[PDB]
């Protein structure tokens, strides 16, 4: 991904570090004081250079001038000395870039602590449109989604009620290899306990006192796509066991049938309950928990991302332009009043409020008194 | 291939004209040019066939009892509307388990010709069958009359659905109103109660006037839309159907059981 | 104090391996295929020779004579191949004395894992002086550590490996009892017999009878077939009972009957069947406290606790976390699923964690970090908030 530059005119120590980084799984390009410009020209940009390992230099002028044209090359490129003691007379202007002074032979600990410090300074120095906002939490969520969307792993979305978990799941599905497949949502808190097994697995012509036809379950509906199990915490324990068995074996059977079918699906589960406490109280299975918790994404409440409300309002109004139930605009005082609200059931209440005022007063403007109740104070 | 719009006609209070609204809305939507299927969710007592004058040889009791499948109980009703008939006082249909309602709703997926209209005529009350058929429908149309009992029953149904299932969007249609101001005032009262206690979205659809042509049509065992196509009630039904055709089609499946989840999954 | 021996006739490979081991801070004596004895005599005795790293041989004779001479030097000296797959030219009983084959250049995690494997080999097979039978390595795969608890577990497993007796594994949920059961099964007289794992908590309480013992035609509503139980599938093998503590009392009586009388009954059957199985029971509940609570059978407890294995929580052997990370990351490299590297701060922060669900938590965290930060350095900042500590 990112290359390393070692600048050393001492060939013995240069080979020493070269084999060490090669062993340590770090990509580097061997350079000397006179041909490093050609190597730099071979670099795609200044960003691809994580750091430079400076060693003995025999070019005219010395190490002091050598840091000058690397400084002219980039001011944000960090420097660490290899096999040279910490300076005591070099100019002070360059001592905000000497991260550490390593000695040959280097040690494993301080090499990675040096490499970690280099990554921190580089980070300090320098497309999910559905999820809008500017808080730290929202961009952390976006980064985690970017990291997990390209791989086949079980995602668990943790948060509170009405925090926007289905949107995150859909963005994960759309930016994956399964984009052309189906998206099948399953709500375990909107299906009775006796119906969940038949709904997920399907049934034959006769399996129980109500089965009148043979139909495909939602695992077979999700074949070639992702299955989004919302409210996994209220799933009954026997159904938890059967779901674990299906996930482990990759095979399932319809209710009232003995034929085994295989389905390749991606599991994205959602929860608002504290699962760990549920395993502690024995109301949830720990094995299913660790099968579903390969990658957890924690969503943040709207009361903790208050500066984001206006953008959410504009986004919600935006989507009503596509689903054709009208439009409405807001006032600055009304927006400030909404920002000063507790908001339990964050995005669900925000969308409910917008829909309610859109149907109530269409193509209007909302003031402080225009809000219905308990939203201005 | 397209998603299918499902409309549940309800209201809790009996005798508010749920079946008349269902039948006449079905015929009007067929008049605009859609392939419409009407289901008589009044499973224990059938009134769609009575109002339309039909005498079905096979009903849904035969489907549940297993003598026949679901396709061969369809009847070609007036205006090209295909009717699913219900039983009338059959011991196997008076009360069904939630498993049986789930099976019947799921079995409807075998039908793949209707042009995104399926009107579901729920029974009176807030019982399990009514809630099961309402939750499975994309649109919920509540028929309310300007009486305290009807307002109370509609509010009770709304409160039940919102409290125990999280439903928040409801369509309200006024029936047997003697003036448009009567319908507007009825909507105002219902919204006043709901806002005082709940946080839900009520959308006014229209008003069906009190018209004796409806009574003559019921006496003749035919539909007011076809028997008296130029009456005030028929014109009101046509206007409502035009308004209903402008409703947004479903696009995404929800987690619970609902009609035609197959079309809501594969199409997107 | 311990030393290695690098014997390879390629000078460059010898030199760069030597400098790698100096970088890791590992003592070494560089050697060749002709003068190793002369420098090997400087060390006190054959025990300080942890292992030998043998590469390519282009000297007189084959590798067989060098292997025999090394075995003569000390019979208990593990061998690590560097950049050379093992050749298929020795008997299957004589092809297993080396521990790992390290691809050139070796990976940090795999090198450390192989060194710890050599240490585990040396610390028990050398000093034993008791096993007249040929040695059986590989019996400790997921058991890596330098704690008192893990060494006690290894001693108990070595005691029980050569005896066919019922085993009771005591440990918290997620400690890794299944791998211990598999290690006991595959390195005992049952190696060719089936290994059948059953989780009592998974089967519903009303179906545990049919699942464990099987049933015949029409045994219950839904019995269209005569499915046979787990015990008969484990005949001539091993059955692994996990969380035996939730198994109800009548099942406990029938299990004791299977253990002593060697007989059981199917569901819907009027005949007794004899099966020869080995029962390795696992639980996470205090069985004694259940005995004075009137929930577990006391006689069953005495019958099972003849060979107990107490697997300690990770929070009580925290100084083994580094080795466990090396094993997990090494497997993750072997399956081409990526690699991660920690600094000292992250490892210390992890060592100060309570770890509920010890090894499953560790593996889940490793997989999560592989997804989050692939090919990067993990510090305290990049760990999840619940793992950060001051
Ligand atoms: N707008 C209207 N004008 C005149 N009569 C009307 C009317 N709407 C409904 N009615 C009358 O109401 C009576 C009942 O109608 P309908 O059978 O449709 O009600 P319903 O289906 O709600 C009763 P239930 O729920 O018990 O089946 C009939 O006499 C019908 O003609
Ligand atoms: Mg009716």
């Amino acid at each position: 991904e990112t290359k390393l530059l070692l600048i050393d005119d001492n060939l013995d120590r240069s080979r020493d570090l070269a084999v060490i980084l090669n062993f340590l799984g770090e990509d580097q390009l061997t350079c000397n004081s006179e041909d490093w410009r050609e190597v730099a020209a071979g670099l795609s940009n200044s960003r691809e250079a994580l750091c430079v390992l400076l060693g003995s230099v025999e070019s005219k002028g010395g190490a002091v001038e050598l840091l000058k044209q690397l400084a002219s090359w980039d001011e944000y490129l960090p420097i660490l000395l290899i096999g040279e003691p910490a300076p005591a007379d070099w100019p002070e202007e360059l001592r905000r870039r000497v991260l550490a002074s390593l000695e040959m032979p280097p040690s494993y600990n301080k090499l990675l602590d040096s490499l970690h410090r280099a990554q921190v300074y580089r980070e300090m120095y320098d497309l999910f449109r559905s999820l809008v906002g500017t808080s730290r939490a929202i961009q952390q969520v976006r980064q985690m989604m970017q990291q997990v969307a390209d791989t086949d792993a079980s995602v668990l979305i943790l948060g509170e009620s009405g925090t926007g978990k289905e949107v995150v799941a859909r963005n994960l599905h759309y930016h994956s290899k399964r984009r052309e497949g189906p998206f099948v949502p399953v709500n375990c808190g909107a299906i009775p306990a006796e119906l969940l097994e038949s709904e997920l697995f399907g049934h034959e012509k006769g399996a129980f006192t109500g089965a009148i036809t043979s139909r495909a379950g939602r695992f077979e509906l999700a074949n070639g796509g992702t299955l989004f199990l919302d409210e996994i915490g209220d799933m009954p324990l026997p159904m938890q066991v059967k779901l674990l068995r299906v996930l482990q074996e990759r095979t399932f059977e319809r209710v009232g049938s003995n034929k085994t079918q295989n389905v390749d699906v991606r599991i994205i589960a959602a929860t608002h309950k504290n699962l760990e406490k549920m395993i502690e109280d024995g109301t949830f299975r720990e094995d299913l928990y660790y099968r579903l918790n390969v990658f957890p994404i924690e969503m943040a409440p709207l009361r903790e991302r208050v500066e984001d409300i206006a953008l959410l309002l504009n986004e919600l109004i935006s989507r009503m332009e596509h689903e054709k139930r009208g439009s409405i605009r807001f006032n600055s005082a009304a927006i400030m009043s909404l920002c000063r609200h507790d908001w339990p059931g964050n995005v669900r209440e925000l969308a409910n409020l917008v829909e309610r005022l859109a149907i109530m007063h269409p193509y209007g403007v909302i003031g402080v008194g225009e809000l219905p109740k308990k939203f201005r104070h | 291939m397209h998603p299918v719009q499902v409309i549940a006609v309800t209201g809790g209070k009996g005798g508010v004209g749920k079946t008349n609204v269902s039948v006449n809305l079905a015929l009007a939507l067929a008049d605009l040019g859609r392939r419409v299927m009407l289901l008589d969710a009044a499973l224990g007592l059938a009134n769609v066939d009575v109002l339309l004058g039909l005498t079905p040889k096979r009903t849904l009791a035969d489907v549940i009892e297993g003598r026949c499948e679901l396709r061969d109980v369809l009847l070609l009703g007036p205006g090209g509307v295909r009717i699913v008939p219900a039983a009338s006082g059959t011991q196997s249909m008076v009360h069904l388990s939630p498993m049986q309602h789930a099976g019947l709703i799921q079995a409807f997926s075998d039908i793949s010709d209707n042009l995104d209209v399926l009107v579901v005529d729920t029974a009176a009350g807030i019982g399990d069958s009514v809630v099961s058929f309402v939750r499975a429908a994309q649109e919920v149309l509540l028929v309310v009359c300007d009486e305290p009992t009807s307002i109370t029953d509609a509010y009770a149904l709304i409160k039940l659905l919102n409290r125990d299932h999280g439903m928040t969007r409801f369509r309200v249609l006024a029936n047997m109103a003697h003036s448009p101001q009567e319908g507007r005032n009825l909507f105002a009262k219902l919204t006043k109660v709901t806002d005082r206690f709940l946080d839900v979205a009520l959308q006014y659809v229209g008003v069906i006037p009190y018209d004796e042509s409806v009574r003559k049509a019921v006496q003749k065992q035919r539909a007011v839309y076809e028997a008296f196509p130029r009456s005030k009630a028929s014109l009101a039904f046509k206007a409502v159907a035009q308004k209903v055709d402008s409703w947004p089609l479903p696009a995404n499946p929800r987690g619970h059981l609902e009609f035609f989840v197959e079309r809501l999954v594969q199409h997107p």
Side-chain angles (χ1 to χ4, degrees), chain A, chain B:
Chain A
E1 194 267 328
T2 290
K3 298 293 183 182
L4 294 174
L5 294 174
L6 61 83
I7 314 297
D8 193 1
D9 289 333
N10 192 357
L11 290 177
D12 291 331
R13 185 178 296 113
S14 178
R15 292 188 296 272
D16 188 358
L17 277 296
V19 65
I20 284 178
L21 282 71
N22 169 235
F23 152 82
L24 183 63
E26 285 281 276
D27 283 20
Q28 84 279 17
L29 279 79
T30 302
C31 310
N32 46 2
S33 298
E34 284 292 329
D35 200 24
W36 75 273
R37 283 290 189 173
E38 280 78 3
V39 182
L43 292 174
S44 70
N45 52 20
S46 191
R47 170 70 262 174
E48 205 177 2
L50 188 153
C51 182
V52 311
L53 288 190
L54 183 63
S56 296
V57 65
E58 290 294 327
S59 70
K60 273 76 69 177
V64 175
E65 62 86 20
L66 183 62
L67 280 180
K68 299 289 94 175
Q69 70 275 17
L70 282 72
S72 70
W73 183 257
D74 180 27
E75 184 66 27
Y76 306 100
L77 175 57
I79 62 170
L80 282 72
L81 294 174
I82 289 298
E84 289 179 352
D89 63 358
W90 297 359
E92 295 296 327
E93 281 82 5
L94 283 71
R95 293 181 184 271
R96 281 82 65 193
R97 293 179 293 173
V98 298
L99 300 202
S101 302
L102 307 185
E103 61 86 20
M104 195 300 297
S107 302
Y108 181 90
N109 286 6
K110 296 183 289 294
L111 194 41
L112 282 72
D113 293 286
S114 66
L115 281 168
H116 180 226
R117 182 65 60 84
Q119 293 179 356
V120 166
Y121 272 102
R122 293 310 295 264
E123 179 67 29
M124 183 177 177
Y125 292 151
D126 172 68
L127 299 97
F128 320 101
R129 188 270 299 164
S130 296
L131 288 146
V132 298
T134 182
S135 296
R136 175 73 176 174
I138 202 57
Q139 47 200 10
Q140 182 62 255
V141 164
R142 277 209 278 279
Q143 174 182 127
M144 294 177 71
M145 293 177 70
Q146 186 62 64
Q147 293 179 356
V148 65
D150 306 358
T151 187
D152 169 342
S154 296
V155 186
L156 181 58
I157 297 169
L158 294 174
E160 295 185 26
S161 57
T163 301
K165 305 181 290 173
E166 185 142 28
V167 176
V168 166
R170 295 196 156 272
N171 296 115
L172 284 186
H173 168 87
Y174 285 158
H175 301 125
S176 179
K177 294 181 176 67
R178 293 181 184 271
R179 185 179 296 113
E180 294 293 328
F183 185 91
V184 180
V186 176
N187 199 344
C188 304
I191 292 170
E194 322 89 346
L195 279 71
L196 191 50
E197 173 191 340
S198 66
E199 182 65 26
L200 267 182
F201 294 146
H203 52 103
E204 294 294 328
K205 179 70 174 179
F208 63 90
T209 183
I212 75 167
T213 187
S214 86
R215 65 181 294 275
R218 303 178 108 101
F219 292 99
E220 163 169 13
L221 271 172
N223 189 359
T226 187
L227 194 70
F228 170 64
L229 315 188
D230 203 331
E231 284 202 70
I232 193 66
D234 53 36
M235 185 180 288
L237 281 153
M239 187 66 204
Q240 281 171 47
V241 174
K242 292 177 71 68
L243 183 77
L244 169 68
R245 180 71 269 169
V246 176
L247 262 65
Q248 284 197 291
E249 196 169 10
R250 295 294 86 193
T251 61
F252 76 106
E253 299 89 4
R254 296 196 186 172
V255 190
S257 162
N258 299 113
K259 270 75 176 175
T260 63
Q261 296 175 356
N262 63 6
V263 285
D264 46 345
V265 298
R266 184 176 179 179
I267 301 299
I268 313 173
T271 313
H272 71 83
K273 292 177 71 68
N274 188 359
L275 284 178
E276 293 179 353
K277 192 69 175 67
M278 293 177 71
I279 297 89
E280 183 178 1
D281 313 330
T283 61
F284 199 77
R285 292 186 65 76
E286 183 178 1
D287 62 358
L288 183 63
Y289 172 60
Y290 283 111
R291 179 67 180 271
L292 298 167
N293 207 47
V294 180
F295 198 79
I297 298 179
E298 293 179 353
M299 294 299 291
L302 196 57
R303 66 185 183 273
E304 319 179 356
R305 65 179 177 88
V306 65
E307 80 274 51
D308 287 80
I309 297 169
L311 283 72
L312 272 178
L313 278 169
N314 302 325
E315 201 43 20
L316 277 159
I317 297 169
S318 178
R319 74 184 66 255
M320 292 180 183
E321 306 295 329
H322 293 286
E323 61 86 20
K324 65 183 182 69
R325 305 292 328 163
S327 178
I328 191 166
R329 297 301 157 167
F330 276 88
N331 184 297
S332 304
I335 297 169
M336 183 278 288
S337 181
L338 287 173
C339 293
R340 293 296 94 197
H341 190 221
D342 187 44
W343 291 114
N346 291 318
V347 176
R348 278 197 295 112
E349 292 180 353
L350 197 69
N352 285 23
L353 187 153
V354 173
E355 182 65 26
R356 186 190 203 175
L357 289 157
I359 65 156
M360 185 180 288
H361 301 114
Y363 307 137
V365 295
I366 297 169
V368 294
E370 182 65 26
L371 298 178
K373 62 179 179 66
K374 74 182 74 173
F375 285 120
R376 81 292 183 276
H377 53 247
Chain B
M1 183 177 177
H2 47 85
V4 172
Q5 183 62 255
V6 190
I7 297 169
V9 173
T10 189
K13 180 67 174 66
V16 295
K18 300 190 280 293
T19 312
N20 269 329
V21 175
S22 296
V23 170
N24 296 316
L25 193 87
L27 281 71
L29 285 175
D31 181 336
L32 282 71
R34 320 265 165 281
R35 281 82 65 193
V36 180
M37 185 179 288
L38 173 55
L39 160 74
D40 189 358
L43 297 170
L45 273 154
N47 293 132
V48 172
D49 62 358
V50 183
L51 294 174
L52 287 176
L54 304 168
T55 61
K57 293 187 286 185
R58 281 82 65 193
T59 67
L60 274 186
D62 291 331
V63 173
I64 297 169
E65 275 178 292
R67 283 82 58 85
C68 63
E69 66 179 1
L70 185 74
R71 289 191 59 78
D72 63 358
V73 311
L74 279 186
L75 282 72
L76 183 63
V81 180
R82 284 137 65 210
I83 307 295
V84 174
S88 185
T90 300
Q91 67 273 17
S92 68
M93 311 270 297
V94 175
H95 180 76
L96 303 165
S97 178
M99 295 299 291
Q100 277 175 305
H101 291 129
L104 187 68
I105 296 178
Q106 284 159 5
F108 292 166
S109 179
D110 291 331
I111 301 299
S112 74
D113 191 29
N114 48 355
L115 184 51
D116 67 277
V117 176
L118 168 69
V119 193
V120 176
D121 189 358
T122 68
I126 53 175
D128 186 74
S129 178
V130 186
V131 175
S132 287
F133 279 100
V134 175
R135 291 185 63 209
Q138 312 294 321
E139 301 298 312
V140 185
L141 182 65
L142 281 81
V143 183
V144 186
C145 311
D146 198 10
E147 284 161 350
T149 61
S150 195
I151 293 163
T152 300
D153 291 331
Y155 166 59
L157 180 63
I158 289 168
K159 182 174 72 68
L160 182 63
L161 291 167
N162 184 225
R163 179 193 65 231
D164 291 331
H165 307 288
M167 294 177 70
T168 45
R169 188 270 299 164
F170 297 103
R171 315 269 177 177
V172 176
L173 176 76
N175 198 7
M176 296 178 278
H178 299 271
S179 187
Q181 191 63 220
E182 177 176 339
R184 284 296 312 169
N185 296 141
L186 166 72
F187 187 68
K189 304 197 253 194
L190 188 61
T191 61
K192 157 157 195 306
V193 175
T194 46
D195 301 2
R196 158 153 65 185
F197 284 99
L198 299 174
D199 48 9
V200 298
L202 278 78
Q203 298 173 94
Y204 192 64
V205 179
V207 65
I208 308 294
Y210 183 92
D211 189 358
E212 61 86 20
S213 298
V214 180
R215 299 191 54 218
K216 292 181 181 179
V218 179
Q219 293 296 325
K220 291 174 70 175
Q221 292 197 81
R222 275 178 64 148
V224 68
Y225 196 88
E226 53 164 349
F228 307 109
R230 283 151 207 119
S231 183
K232 292 186 295 184
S234 297
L235 298 170
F237 274 118
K238 187 147 181 91
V240 168
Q242 264 164 358
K243 216 169 171 313
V244 170
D245 196 6
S246 87
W247 286 352
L249 282 72
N252 280 358
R254 292 188 296 272
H256 53 74
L257 160 56
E258 46 185 275
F259 296 100
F260 311 128
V261 72
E262 294 293 328
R263 323 270 293 258
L264 281 176
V265 175
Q266 287 70 241
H267 193 233

